Write an enzyme that holds these catalytic residues in place. Structure first.
Site, PDB file in Angstrom:
ATOM      1  CG  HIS A 193       2.399   3.518  -4.681  1.00  0.00           C
ATOM      2  ND1 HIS A 193       1.118   3.731  -5.145  1.00  0.00           N
ATOM      3  CD2 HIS A 193       2.365   2.341  -4.013  1.00  0.00           C
ATOM      4  CE1 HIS A 193       0.343   2.728  -4.773  1.00  0.00           C
ATOM      5  NE2 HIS A 193       1.072   1.872  -4.087  1.00  0.00           N
ATOM      6  CG  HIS A 208      -0.230   1.468   1.164  1.00  0.00           C
ATOM      7  ND1 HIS A 208      -0.204   2.732   0.613  1.00  0.00           N
ATOM      8  CD2 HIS A 208      -0.003   0.608   0.145  1.00  0.00           C
ATOM      9  CE1 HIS A 208       0.028   2.640  -0.683  1.00  0.00           C
ATOM     10  NE2 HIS A 208       0.152   1.363  -0.992  1.00  0.00           N
ATOM     11  CG  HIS A 231       3.949  -6.660  -5.381  1.00  0.00           C
ATOM     12  ND1 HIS A 231       3.093  -5.888  -6.138  1.00  0.00           N
ATOM     13  CD2 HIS A 231       3.788  -6.247  -4.100  1.00  0.00           C
ATOM     14  CE1 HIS A 231       2.451  -5.040  -5.353  1.00  0.00           C
ATOM     15  NE2 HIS A 231       2.856  -5.236  -4.110  1.00  0.00           N
ATOM     16  CD  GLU A 243      -0.512  -1.720  -4.581  1.00  0.00           C
ATOM     17  OE1 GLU A 243      -0.601  -1.294  -3.408  1.00  0.00           O
ATOM     18  OE2 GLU A 243       0.492  -1.531  -5.317  1.00  0.00           O
TER      19      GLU A 243
END
Ligand SMILES: [Fe+3]
Ligand SMILES: [Fe+3]
Lengths: 132, 298, 298, 132
Positions: free
Chosen positions: C11, C60, C194, C241
């Site tokens: 996303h 976020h 990441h 995540e």
């Protein structure tokens, strides 16, 4: 474990309307309007012209009338919650005792005497189908 | 690093208004404030004053409206302002928190599998400041740090008595792992029996209330099994606030000593309750009288 | 009334921008959008399109700032507007939720001892809307209702893999007990490996990623035991995540069939993954090919 | 269970500053400032005079200088969180890849090529004490 069974039971308590999701959803606007009275300026504006104030909150005709009529039983029927609504009678200058007694149909004097005497007895007002 | 005592107390706004209008000594309120005197004296004594107070209460649609409803929240802010609930902010000093211990407990609770909601800014309504006024009087500044701990009991369903009880033990574990040797208190506020709504408003159940107090001391594990429906039925729809008492109780060991107990009817629409519990192991000497019951009906 | 399929997807904002700026078909993005094509063609097929999508993602710092941080939240509102994250509101249709199922799920999770935070008003950032764009394209209105389910993985500690997994099973139960016979999906979004911060930014761990997908399918219970530190060390600080994918997985039964899997490096700063899982019992036929791995390094 | 043990290992990860409670408390003003850039009005004012805008947020001189210099590594050192700070580089019209690359010391181009080639390998950057 069973949300439907959990919720169904609350319907067996007399003179009580548990604040469940269904009621929360219905009284969302009325409760949010009441919350707006936490601001001194909003209170002053509401006082200036109550009807006009209520029009900005998209209340149902029933809910709007209940507020202007200060019928707390009617307001709870429209989804209002006692704690949210306390903001309304607070700006009116009334106490929690006032609001509660006003919903019993008793006079402010009798309600006070009743509390002094020990309050309302649970005997007979616990179950609608059990009669106790 | 130590949970020395557990205290419960009423937090109704009327008590706050009595203080304000200097009517706390009238014929109606005098008996009530008389009952808190022993607590006010006890706590102020040397070594009884806590360093921090984890104050458990339910926000009364003040800090939270209909848009955000957290089950368990913890105020990790440095300062908390009294909320304006329609009369203007309560004229009491600002609540000073303890971010170090607050954030410590927050992290521990989440690691202990509690889905905490961390608050870094929130006004504290009467549920949090009234107990302060009742036990610390009217100081120019509160004598200790306070960590607000709002629990949802306004929108259904509220957490379960079992969950509340388990949460208290977790809070104690968290406090105990804090590196500093602090004297921490856990106050469970709210209650007792009462109904603010409808034809059934005014309901009082001294039988229920007195039994709750008894079991909370001797058998909290069984008490934590009592379902929501029973509170609603026996103690009035608003009497469900009592579940919050299990949070305070769960933070104390199995064996506790009750130093003081005060029960009075009526206090506005409610039956007022207040007590001091301490781990039997380090419990101080009970107060004299250790138990008191006021009210025209008692 | 039924959780028919589980889907995971990236996303990251960069994908919504490729679409916005009409570059989704260039040399860099083309392979990525091509990899989503099979999901797009699959979901449209009659009986494959869901009525409601429970989208699990992490906010976020959009709907929640530093003043309120809920571990688990559920959107029970009617409509959710795309948030403005610095470039103006994302130019996509408003997200229409399902208050009935949402509130039912919320009430069930609390009764099941998950300390939920109910949201009746909140903006949805790219975490929620990018997956909808990737799977539903650019319709004038989304083809189904969506229930946003924000999970905190921003401020530590985030919930445990074990908690997320368990929560997934709780959601399935609440869904199955919902009266209407809805075709419900649970989407686990975010990841994969990441790192966005510091000197170690740019980190990609294909070994970790592929292993994660593998265990998520066959041994989720063991994968849920993986500690936070292992995610951080191996998959990058932001790769954590992936814990959210366990929520989706937990909503599916023990035996699942993976109908399709896409893995690609790079997609902005990440390794991108997307897949479709269905209970073996009612699963459909896997796609041809079943697994696709693109990227210059693959 | 040991909250201290849990946070302690976050210290052994090279080139990584995990957003723990400690950092969150230290960077509260910086992150709340970044949050404000979500409203277009604030975005435009800040852009008109950054220094004057920043002064309304009571940041430390180190935090303010980091923002003015667009030094993300420095900003993170002052308690800034990457997702809150995305509001700032989004205000500048920069992508998440630009921000990330800017914190690695490589040129934007070298970072991009590296990602294409497969990204940064975990080899040697998992443990400070271990060196692997
Ligand atoms: Fe209360
Ligand atoms: Fe994300």
């Amino acid at each position: 474990i069973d949300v439907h069974a959990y919720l169904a039971e609350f319907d067996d308590i007399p003179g009580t309307r548990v604040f469940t999701a269904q009621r929360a959803r219905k009284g969302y606007n009325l409760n949010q309007f009441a919350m707006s009275l936490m601001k001194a300026e909003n209170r002053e504006r509401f006082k200036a012209d109550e009807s006009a104030y209520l029009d900005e909150w998209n209340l149902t005709p029933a809910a709007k009338a209940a507020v202007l009529a200060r019928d707390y039983n009617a307001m709870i029927d429209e989804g209002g919650n006692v704690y949210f609504l306390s903001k309304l009678f607070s700006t009116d200058g009334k106490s929690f005792q006032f609001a509660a007694g006003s919903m019993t149909g008793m006079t402010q004097e009798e309600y006070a005497q009743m509390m002094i005497d020990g309050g309302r007895s649970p005997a007979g007002v616990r179950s609608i189908k059990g009669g106790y | 690093a130590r949970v020395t005592t557990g205290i419960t107390s009423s937090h109704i706004p009327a008590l706050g208004a009595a203080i304000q209008t200097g009517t706390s000594d009238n014929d109606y309120w005098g008996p009530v404030f008389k009952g808190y005197q022993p607590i006010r004296d006890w706590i102020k004594q040397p070594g009884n004053m806590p360093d921090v107070v984890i104050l458990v209460y339910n926000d009364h649609a003040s800090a939270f409206d209909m848009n955000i409803i957290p089950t368990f929240a913890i105020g990790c802010a440095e300062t908390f302002k009294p909320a304006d609930e329609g009369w203007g902010p309560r004229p009491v000093p600002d609540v000073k928190g303890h971010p170090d211990l607050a954030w410590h407990i927050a992290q521990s609770l989440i690691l202990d599998e509690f889905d905490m909601t961390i608050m870094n800014q929130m006004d504290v309504d009467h549920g949090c400041t009234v107990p302060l006024s009742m036990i610390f009087g009217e100081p120019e500044e509160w004598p200790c740090k306070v960590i607000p701990f709002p629990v949802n009991v306004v929108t259904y369903p509220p957490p379960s008595g079992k969950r509340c009880f388990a949460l208290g033990d977790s809070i104690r574990a968290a406090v105990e792992s804090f590196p500093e040797d602090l004297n921490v208190h856990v106050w469970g506020t709210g209650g007792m029996s009462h109904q603010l709504q409808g034809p059934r408003a005014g309901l009082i159940n001294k039988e229920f209330d007195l039994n709750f107090i008894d079991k909370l001391i001797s058998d909290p594990e069984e008490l934590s099994k009592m379902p929501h429906i029973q509170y609603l039925r026996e103690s009035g729809s608003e009497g469900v606030e009592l579940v919050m008492w299990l949070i305070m109780r769960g933070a104390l060991p199995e064996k506790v000593r009750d130093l003081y107990t005060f029960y009075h009817i009526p206090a506005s629409n409610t039956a007022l309750g207040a007590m001091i519990l301490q781990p039997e192991e380090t419990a101080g000497t009970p107060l004299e009288p250790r138990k008191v019951m006021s009210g025209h009906s008692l």
